[PDB]
Structure 1
Amino acid sequence: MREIVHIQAGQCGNQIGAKFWEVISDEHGIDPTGSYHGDSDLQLERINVYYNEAAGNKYVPRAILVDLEPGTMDSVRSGPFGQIFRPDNFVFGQSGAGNNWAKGHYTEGAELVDSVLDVVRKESESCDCLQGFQLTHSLGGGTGSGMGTLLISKIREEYPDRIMNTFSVVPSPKVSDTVVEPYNATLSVHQLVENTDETYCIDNEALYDICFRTLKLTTPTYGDLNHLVSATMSGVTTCLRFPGQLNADLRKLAVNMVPFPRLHFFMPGFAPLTSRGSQQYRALTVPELTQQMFDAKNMMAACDPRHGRYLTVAAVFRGRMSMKEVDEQMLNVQNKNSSYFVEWIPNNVKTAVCDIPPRGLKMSATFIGNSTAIQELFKRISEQFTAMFRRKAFLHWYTGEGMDEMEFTEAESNMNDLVSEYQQYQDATA
């Protein structure tokens, strides 16, 4: 349990992973050439978890990039740090899937899945004691979702003993590339729950809402959402990139957070929110942010925790800490909202403290939570899939590639079973 390897897929997933690497390299003092350029020894202590040593003192991300469309990969080297990633990671296709899951799963996913498994192997036996695998990818887009399903299936059948995390980009009706997204979305979430154990639900609905009302962006482009995506999804990895007695590894993350083998979905949150170019924030005090965690308006999953009960709660604080008052805030929050925590899991609200703050901000606090209230997202996608599927439309493309509607029925039944699990765990007494 020592190192992490990264995989990204889909143009959305590739973009957000690239911005993630931007942020991580910037906070760890890693120049575009991989040499250390920070000002403290904290960054270099755990730099190995997300980077590999190279010739001299160059540090390279352990990121395998995959994408079926050449435009995305041209773009990904078009931006900054497009040269730090070694060409070996870049194993790509050309046909393009275009909002379909099974077609890219079988008709065109085979001839590159072998190569991606080969490269992740080379990374694996190149690595010593890796914790596991974390994947960032899109779900509504058929290309990225299908590639992610291929990768998760192959890695689990190849490395079942490694805690294998993933990051999910839930499709948004408001910002939707196509309309046939819920098909692949349901198929991929079924595969995700049936095959993985660590996932963060980052829906573009919540990102669009927060970038619209709070960032005052009338038409927030994908970069506007990606900014907050990168901020929060670096925040989740803060506990995995700096020394700390909380959330040392992915396996510890799972053991602390997920209580049940099926339900392993996450509802990430982070405050204070920061727009693009907005640096008017003062020294935010701990009480306002620790009361702001309860808010669903700063939540990066399209759900409201007030409608559910938290199972397990994680949060990391960054900046200058007089963390005695932070513990006092814990005490007040517990004594004031014990009704929103399951009584049968005492001492589930634990936090750590970090000293490296994010960029331009001297105070920050990520809010990682697992609550049954995330079932609102699954109810939304279920009602969408049912109301757009009872006509039995758009199935021609899938059924032409070996898809049988029995797969759709079993997937929807399983996901409704997850919804039922949510409902029964929500009302559980003490």
Structure 2
Amino acid sequence: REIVHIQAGQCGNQIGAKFWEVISDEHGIDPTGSYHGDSDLQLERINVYYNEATGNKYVPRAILVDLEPGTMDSVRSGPFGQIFRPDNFVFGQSGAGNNWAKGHYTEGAELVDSVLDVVRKESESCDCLQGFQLTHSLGGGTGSGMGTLLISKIREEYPDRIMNTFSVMPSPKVSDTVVEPYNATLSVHQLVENTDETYCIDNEALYDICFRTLKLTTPTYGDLNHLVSATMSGVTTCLRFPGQDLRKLAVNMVPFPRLHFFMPGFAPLTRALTVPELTQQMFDSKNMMAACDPRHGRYLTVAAIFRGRMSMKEVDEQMLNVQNKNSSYFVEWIPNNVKTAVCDIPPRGLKMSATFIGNSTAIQELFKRISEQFTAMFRRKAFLHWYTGEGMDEMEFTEAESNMNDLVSEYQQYQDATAD
């Protein structure tokens, strides 16, 4: 069962390319595109992300999208550039200039039809399409505006299939662009309704890990993208490896439709770690890709994935330990809400690793942060004519703000919920 990947905007294509390079090495596929791995577990579930082509060579089922045509050459310039098939590059005349309306309603709408054409041709060649994942940021205008428009369009064409997103949230520590709260609030307004799971990749987190932990004076985007790639690899592990699908994880992780925003975590960040080390470190706020202290909220559901050669008896023992040892941080009204998976194949370089996916109400901290920044500008209607000039009304901003405030409200109500 196949998955179609789409990467939109600068950031989306950046972390999308790094992700492909990661899993292609994990599956043993060179830039040429031919399988040169040593085992069989690297092909058995490879159809999920790759399409077999003539010459015994696999090509990523990926579609690259941006209104700025230069990012296309950047991806093809980067390593594993020729592995993507040229007909899946859909590029516009020039970028959206961080204007969400340009990507969602005007310029992005011009390019969206050809994008849906590439999506259609890839989806019809699938035996049974699982769904789509989209990598993008929420601060700019392409992945933010056009991304939401894409996932909304793809929903009309495929109402019953899964839509996952890897959304990168803005942080003043990373970018000085001022209207990013506007774009993030508008796209989140779209994400709350149009996606089944969204992995909130906080640039504030990524910056904090590289600086306060990895000890990097001035970290470049390439430093942060290494984190995103390792999480994305670790999150998609069981999808791409046999033994250990989309709808099931969504059914088990999402107890309520709007609360489908997950705080990711990886361990280790960069002497193989121990299962108790990995287990503890994995539930630590210093190892979360969202700037949210999970001790400030409660876990609704938790899915763990361990990688490498280890005794699953110990994995169980430790996972139960951290659960009871921190009982209060798990809702009592969702029994067996923490599940665990183990795959023998470890990531590149690491012998021991673990990835954490948590539907936690502490993620409201992230959305609150956006809401405050959004409110500070909207109250003085700062820079709104840039969006109004494209045809948008002020009430759409008001709807996005209130809907996001509802989302953090909901998260807090269930945080305070009692078994009776």
- When the two structures are superposed, what TM-score results if normalisation uses the length of structure 1? 0.96
Partner of 2:286, secondary structure, is coil
Aligned twin of 1:416: 405
Q: Residues 329-387 of structure 1, C-alpha deviation per residue, up to 9 Å, x if partnerless?
A: 12211221111110111111110110000111110010111110000001100111111
Q: Residues 122-159 of structure 1, C-alpha deviation per residue, up to 9 Å, x if partnerless?
A: 01111110100110011001122111011111001111
In the alignment, the residues of structure 2 paired with residue 337 and residue 244 of structure 1 have an alpha-carbon distance, to the nearest angstrom, of 30
Partner of 2:90, secondary structure, is coil
In the alignment, the residues of structure 2 paired with residue 171 and residue 390 of structure 1 have an alpha-carbon distance, to the nearest angstrom, of 20
* Residues 64 and 88 in structure 2, CA contact (< 8 A), matched pair in contact too: yes
In the alignment, the residues of structure 1 paired with residue 254 and residue 401 of structure 2 have an alpha-carbon distance, to the nearest angstrom, of 23
In the alignment, the residues of structure 2 paired with residue 77 and residue 153 of structure 1 have an alpha-carbon distance, to the nearest angstrom, of 28
Partner of 1:43, secondary structure, is coil
In the alignment, the residues of structure 2 paired with residue 56 and residue 409 of structure 1 have an alpha-carbon distance, to the nearest angstrom, of 54
In the alignment, the residues of structure 2 paired with residue 35 and residue 413 of structure 1 have an alpha-carbon distance, to the nearest angstrom, of 50
Q: Residues 93-145 of structure 1, C-alpha deviation per residue, up to 9 Å, x if partnerless?
A: 01221100112322212221110111100011111101001100110011221
Pair 1:273-2:273 in alignment: no
- When the two structures are superposed, what TM-score results if normalisation uses the length of structure 2? 0.98
Aligned twin of 1:351: 340
Q: Residues 73-98 of structure 1, C-alpha deviation per residue, up to 9 Å, x if partnerless?
A: 11111111111111110111012211
* Residues 189 and 404 in structure 2, CA contact (< 8 A), matched pair in contact too: yes
In the alignment, the residues of structure 2 paired with residue 7 and residue 330 of structure 1 have an alpha-carbon distance, to the nearest angstrom, of 34
Partner of 2:272, secondary structure, is coil
Point out the more displaced range, 172-181 or 81-90: 172-181
* Residues 266 and 354 in structure 2, CA contact (< 8 A), matched pair in contact too: yes
Runs of 4+ aligned structure 1 residues displaced above 6 Å come to none
- Offset of residue 27 of structure 1: 0.5
In the alignment, the residues of structure 2 paired with residue 109 and residue 155 of structure 1 have an alpha-carbon distance, to the nearest angstrom, of 14
Aligned twin of 1:380: 369
* Residues 67 and 111 in structure 2, CA contact (< 8 A), matched pair in contact too: no
Q: Residues 157-196 of structure 1, C-alpha deviation per residue, up to 9 Å, x if partnerless?
A: 1111101111101011111151111111100000011211
* Residues 46 and 240 in structure 2, CA contact (< 8 A), matched pair in contact too: yes
* Residues 172 and 203 in structure 1, CA contact (< 8 A), matched pair in contact too: yes
Query: Between the two proteins, what is the percent identity of the paired residues?
Result: 99
Point out the more displaced range, 51-60 or 333-342: 333-342
- Offset of residue 294 of structure 1: 2.1
Aligned twin of 1:46: 45
In the alignment, the residues of structure 1 paired with residue 132 and residue 66 of structure 2 have an alpha-carbon distance, to the nearest angstrom, of 18
* Residues 24 and 234 in structure 1, CA contact (< 8 A), matched pair in contact too: yes
- CA 34–177 in structure 1, closer or farther in 2 if over 3 Å, else same: farther
Point out the more displaced range, 173-182 or 305-314: 173-182
* Residues 109 and 146 in structure 2, CA contact (< 8 A), matched pair in contact too: no
* Residues 244 and 352 in structure 1, CA contact (< 8 A), matched pair in contact too: no
Aligned twin of 2:349: 360
* Residues 293 and 367 in structure 1, CA contact (< 8 A), matched pair in contact too: yes
In the alignment, the residues of structure 2 paired with residue 114 and residue 220 of structure 1 have an alpha-carbon distance, to the nearest angstrom, of 37
In the alignment, the residues of structure 2 paired with residue 353 and residue 213 of structure 1 have an alpha-carbon distance, to the nearest angstrom, of 30
* Residues 103 and 144 in structure 2, CA contact (< 8 A), matched pair in contact too: no
* Residues 137 and 168 in structure 1, CA contact (< 8 A), matched pair in contact too: yes
In the alignment, the residues of structure 1 paired with residue 13 and residue 229 of structure 2 have an alpha-carbon distance, to the nearest angstrom, of 12
* Residues 108 and 142 in structure 2, CA contact (< 8 A), matched pair in contact too: no
Partner of 1:347, secondary structure, is coil
* Residues 258 and 370 in structure 1, CA contact (< 8 A), matched pair in contact too: yes
In the alignment, the residues of structure 1 paired with residue 212 and residue 261 of structure 2 have an alpha-carbon distance, to the nearest angstrom, of 26
Q: Residues 238-291 of structure 1, C-alpha deviation per residue, up to 9 Å, x if partnerless?
A: 12111134xxx11011011111011111100011112xxxxxxx0211111111
Partner of 1:115, secondary structure, is helix
Partner of 1:179, secondary structure, is coil
2:390 to 390, 401, 408: 401
In the alignment, the residues of structure 1 paired with residue 109 and residue 359 of structure 2 have an alpha-carbon distance, to the nearest angstrom, of 35
In the alignment, the residues of structure 1 paired with residue 381 and residue 84 of structure 2 have an alpha-carbon distance, to the nearest angstrom, of 44
Point out the more displaced range, 17-26 or 31-40: 31-40
In the alignment, the residues of structure 2 paired with residue 305 and residue 184 of structure 1 have an alpha-carbon distance, to the nearest angstrom, of 26
In the alignment, the residues of structure 2 paired with residue 164 and residue 269 of structure 1 have an alpha-carbon distance, to the nearest angstrom, of 21
- CA 354–416 in structure 1, closer or farther in 2 if over 3 Å, else same: same
In the alignment, the residues of structure 2 paired with residue 151 and residue 12 of structure 1 have an alpha-carbon distance, to the nearest angstrom, of 16
Segments of 5+ residues of structure 2 without an aligned counterpart are: none
